[PDB]
Design a protein around this ligand. Structure first.
Ligand SMILES: C[S@@+](CC[C@H](N)C(=O)[O-])C[C@H]1O[C@@H](n2cnc3c(N)ncnc32)[C@H](O)[C@@H]1O
Ligand SMILES: C[S@@+](CC[C@H](N)C(=O)[O-])C[C@H]1O[C@@H](n2cnc3c(N)ncnc32)[C@H](O)[C@@H]1O
Lengths: 194, 201
């Protein structure tokens, strides 16, 4: 199944509460700032064996990890993605920025999903190199995230979906996506890409 | 130059205060209520106008360290990171292997900092090394080529590098081979003396 809503994630959670909605994994790329709050409100929706994968900057990453663990989750690890072709800035005075961070947490007593192909170890999921969106996470990245932390059909929820691409990864992997967007141009971008 | 002290860093910082000690770069690997973020507040005054800090941390502490650093008059430029060629591995089938070590790079606020990129172009992952063997000693917080690359980048040959928690002295030894003028402190004597034997008494 694929459902996209054009809504504010913070008010639409009340509808999901009454409906007793329960999703397997929350895989999202979030944008006086909380941003820790949505986590508190979307945490109840996760099934006992479920997990979260949350994109974040390293400036916020420790906060989110600690916050997650106050909400009944255990932060298992970090995942990260590197582009092969950074547009270089201040090459001589500073490190180029090729890296994107995400946090992987699971529910506290959960028996979670991992899925390693016959192969060994892990932890930099991808080597990777479309939309008009300002910040879009790529498809191949999202597809790998999903192949790992979810199973052939699980219910994946992305409260901030942007251009989608969390869904598109789910659709291609047959992963049952639900997603939300507040603004109309992004919602429709996500909609016809699906 | 190489000088090592055996002391509690929080106890020796007062001595450094009145001794008017000034160090160019604090490159350290701290240990992990508290608030072992405070040493940062206390060791900040010792850093020269153009100086910098490099602080090893878990991704669980990295955001805290970053914000505190920037409250003490430093600007966080970036993070640096190291990957082992040889993870053990542990808990493979159920989990990610642990191959990574994180550190934070900040500079004093209006500083003209060092960096030093070789004519060779980019990253952000100073080194993927093999993890220590016959340089490997007796301590679990223990790597050298990493410290040498960290130093080759964020310091210049005659600068003064301070490691308030020096552990086995892997920062001192790196400084020595790169001719970098090391100062270091250690609380434990088995660690202090090993470092002392690594830097040639
Ligand atoms: C940082 S972007 C991530 C984009 C997405 N990961 C992609 O691949 O394109 C987060 C998105 O969440 C949307 N958003 C912001 N506030 C929201 C809210 N209150 N409720 C639902 N969506 C929101 C924004 O429109 C933004 O495009
Ligand atoms: C993470 S280890 C650093 C090890 C070192 N980087 C190495 O490669 O060998 C931190 C060290 O700081 C020491 N330590 C703990 N408290 C200290 C203090 N108050 N002052 C100085 N050193 C301390 C510990 O004994 C430990 O050896």
């Amino acid at each position: 199944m694929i459902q996209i809503y054009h809504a504010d994630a913070f008010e639409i959670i009340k509808d999901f509460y009454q409906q007793n909605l329960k999703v397997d994994a929350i895989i999202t790329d979030p944008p006086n700032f909380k941003l820790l709050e949505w986590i508190a409100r979307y945490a109840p929706l996760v099934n006992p064996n479920g997990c979260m994968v949350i994109f974040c900057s390293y400036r916020f990453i420790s906060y989110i990890a600690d916050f997650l663990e106050e909400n009944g989750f255990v932060v298992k690890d970090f995942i990260q993605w590197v582009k092969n072709n950074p547009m270089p800035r201040n090459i001589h005075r500073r490190y180029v920025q090729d890296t994107e961070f995400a946090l992987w947490a699971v529910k506290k007593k959960a028996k979670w999903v991992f899925n390693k192909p016959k192969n060994e170890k892990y932890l930099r999921p991808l080597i990777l190199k479309k939309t008009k969106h300002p910040t879009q996470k790529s498809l191949a990245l999202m597809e790998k995230i999903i192949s790992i932390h979810t199973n052939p059909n699980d219910i994946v929820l992305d409260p901030f979906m942007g251009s989608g691409t969390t869904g598109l990864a789910c659709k291609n992997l047959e992963r049952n996506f639900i997603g939300i967007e507040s603004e109309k141009e992004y919602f429709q971008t996500a909609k016809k890409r699906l």
